[PDB]
């Protein structure tokens, strides 16, 4: 991974994102969503992630 004082920054771009494989992986100890509740991610489209 990358340090905390120089974090990394990847600019995901035009693709097919499946936040369900994330959302249900049960391997994550913390999964908070703020602007938008998690289950509605696989039904929206943005400009950049």
């Amino acid at each position: 991974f990358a340090s905390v004082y120089a974090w990394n920054r990847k600019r995901i771009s035009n693709c097919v994102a499946d936040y369900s494989v994330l959302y249900n992986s049960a391997s994550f100890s913390t999964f908070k969503c703020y602007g938008v509740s998690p289950t509605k991610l696989n039904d929206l489209c943005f400009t950049n992630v």
Binding site: N24, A26, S37
Partner: protein
């Protein structure tokens, strides 16, 4: 009503109203206007074996 079960330690956060996860999605779902209380305690010595 009293419902009883056993889960991992860090899955106790999905046992409430308006939650999501492998547990709350399809194992045990709490309505969004729940009324009762949720109680949980560690049981490592009883349920885990060598």
């Amino acid at each position: 009503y009293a419902d009883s079960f056993v889960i991992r330690g860090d899955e106790v956060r999905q046992i409430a109203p308006g939650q999501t996860g492998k547990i709350a999605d399809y194992n045990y779902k709490l309505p969004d206007d729940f009324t009762g209380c949720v109680i949980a305690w560690n049981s490592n010595n009883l349920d885990s074996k060598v």
